[PDB]
Design a protein that fits this description.
The structure is a homodimer. By secondary structure, chain A is mainly alpha-helical. The first copy, chain A, has helices spanning 2-51, 55-68, 79-90, 103-145, 150-176, 180-191, 207-210, 212-234, 238-241. Chain A has nine helices and no strands. The complex binds cholesterol hemisuccinate (Y01) (6 copies) and potassium ion (5 copies). One cholesterol hemisuccinate is lined by residues 79-80, 83, 209, 212, 215-216, 219 of chain B. One cholesterol hemisuccinate (Y01) is lined by residues 79-80, 83, 209, 212, 215-216, 219 of chain B. Chains A, B: Glycans are attached at residue 52. Chains A, B: The chain crosses the membrane at residues 8-28, 107-127, 153-173, 213-233. Chains A, B: Belongs to the two pore domain potassium channel (TC 1.A.1.8) family. Chains A, B: It catalyses: K(+)(in) = K(+)(out); Na(+)(in) = Na(+)(out).
Chain lengths: 242, 242
């Protein structure tokens, strides 16, 4: 019946989209990955030959460097670091810069996520609804000064999202030595709750302990962007959900 | 008015929860992080003293090791690797094992996420609704063989979630050299779309190219668990949402 027809039609489209994306990603990244692997292998071979590093100690050095990578940015388990980790956990971002090393800590993190995800989702939904109402009121007032259609609301939301993305990209590029495109990409990744972790803010020269204003601004920007995205999402998707 | 009262009451509870979580995480991880940092610093100092490694070349070695970490697991941009990356992107997991290195690739990934997230969400919601209806029908048939309350449905969903988590943990522990607790934690992280990236499957001895059955089973388990979690989320969260 329809329900099954729609359920099976969605699956086929999703599978086709996944296949197309995988094919494009392979065709675009195979040569680059091969070249990077060749260059890295040549460099490491040259370094090993020059320094006569033993093969057994190479694995130990790799493990030490990998384990000490988060520690090179300072102390990541202070009050600011713990707050950042909790914010990433509740928002399902998963940056991966710092992870618990204790089984009890892992269990506590799991319980924290379980007890916090629905509350954060409900709060974000309420904030998005309130922002949508405020935006509608502002648009009505502006039109009176100068009825509202959906398309106008959709365009206003898209423009607001683009402006927020541009502002965040400029702010993060002018305070962390990042390119405009790289900052925009990082902001988009952060606001979509994906969290690749390739670019992580508040990880340079101990900014988590010496720049409280920057941390506060980053938290405010993250919350504002999440609220903005939660309105565009529920005003284009929730209509077809139920 | 109530609306603002509820909106402001949610915020206070969320902030208190964040503060409590940050305090607990700090009090639980400060000493462990300090000990790990001290041990790593001592080990690296001893290694540098023994091998007489120059300071300038140490940064180059660290950069080479960091850039070559994904490549140590094989080829991550093949058909299987591209499919895995696309699956992680559309599901907003963000493992971070492989990331694009080209600006055009990053733009394509951003467009892919934008065009794929709503479709995946709608498909997951439909699958969860269908599974919920099937579970209700099965429960009614079982009760007839031996009306349904909401508490019974919640208990059945929780039991199904626990069973799926246990099965996935056992399967991933018996095929990737992992402990039961670590496998359970990794499965929980994967199913919540957090994606810390500390534990990533299909990254050992080139399993992405030599074990197609394992990759297919992992994909099926991920999809099933995502549907199961989405169903429970629909039961608990949507009733209080609208
Ligand atoms: C196993 C997992 C999925 C459990 C998830 C727990 C939720 C069912 C709880 C956790 C936080 C709760 C919320 C915390 C705070 C509030 C504000 C509260 O508002 C008021 O008390 C003032 C307004 C009014 O009088 O309704 C209404 C319930 C609500 C949304 C709660 C609804 C139920 C929530 C989402
Ligand atoms: C209404 C729209 C179009 C504009 C919104 C105003 C922005 C232009 C302002 C509002 C908040 C500002 C930010 C608030 C806090 C900071 C931290 C501040 O950092 C420091 O002062 C310490 C580090 C340093 O020395 O750079 C640098 C500027 C910045 C990013 C500000 C940049 C300019 C921002 C984004
Ligand atoms: C209704 C909305 C607008 C409430 C917004 C609340 C903010 C004003 C608060 C909430 C969380 C706070 C942050 C939580 C944690 C920290 C780390 C804290 O760092 C330390 O305590 C160590 C470094 C130092 O000694 O300054 C500095 C303040 C800061 C950035 C706080 C700044 C003020 C913030 C952003
Ligand atoms: C900028 C971003 C937010 C754009 C998001 C795009 C969505 C508005 C699109 C993308 C995929 C679309 C879905 C793709 C497939 C289908 C199945 C389709 O079902 C059928 O064609 C059979 C049943 C029927 O006849 O209705 C109904 C619409 C729907 C849910 C579409 C609804 C609109 C969706 C969610
Ligand atoms: C109804 C519930 C209670 C049980 C569901 C059945 C499971 C016990 C089965 C169903 C799918 C099975 C998996 C399907 C595929 C594989 C890949 C398979 O890998 C290989 O054959 C190649 C690698 C190797 O040589 O180990 C190892 C077993 C495993 C994980 C299977 C383990 C047992 C599973 C989870
Ligand atoms: C309605 C539902 C049940 C549909 C389920 C579809 C699956 C049966 C398909 C969809 C995606 C497929 C996978 C997509 C990609 C790959 C990588 C592919 O690897 C290669 O082509 C290189 C290695 C080799 O030569 O085997 C092996 C098959 C596999 C695991 C496929 C196995 C079969 C899968 C899981
Ligand atoms: K992530
Ligand atoms: K990550
Ligand atoms: K990582
Ligand atoms: K997510
Ligand atoms: K994520």
């Amino acid at each position: 019946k329809r329900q099954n027809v729609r359920t099976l039609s969605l699956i086929v489209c999703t599978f086709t989209y996944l296949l197309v994306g995988a094919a494009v990603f392979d065709a675009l990244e195979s040569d680059h990955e091969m070249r990077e692997e060749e260059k890295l292998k040549a460099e490491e071979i040259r370094i090993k030959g020059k320094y006569n590093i033993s093969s057994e100690d190479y694995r130990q050095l790799e493990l030490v460097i990998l384990q000490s990578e988060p520690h090179r940015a300072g102390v990541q388990w202070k009050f600011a670091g713990s707050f950042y980790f909790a914010i990433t956990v509740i928002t399902t971002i998963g940056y991966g810069h710092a992870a618990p090393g204790t089984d009890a800590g892992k269990a506590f993190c799991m319980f924290y996520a379980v007890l916090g995800i629905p509350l954060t989702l409900v709060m974000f939904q309420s904030l998005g609804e309130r922002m949508n109402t405020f935006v509608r009121y502002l648009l009505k007032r502006i039109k009176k000064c100068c009825d509202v259609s959906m398309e106008n609301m959709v365009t206003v939301g898209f423009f607001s999202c683009m402006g927020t993305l541009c502002i965040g990209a400029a702010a993060f590029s002018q305070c962390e030595e990042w390119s405009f495109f790289h900052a925009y990409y990082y902001c988009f990744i952060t606001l979509t709750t994906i969290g690749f972790g390739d670019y992580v803010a508040l990880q340079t020269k101990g900014a988590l302990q010496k720049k409280p204003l920057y941390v506060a601004f980053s938290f405010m920007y993250i919350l504002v962007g999440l609220t903005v995205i939660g309105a565009f999402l529920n005003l284009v998707v929730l209509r077809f959900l139920t």
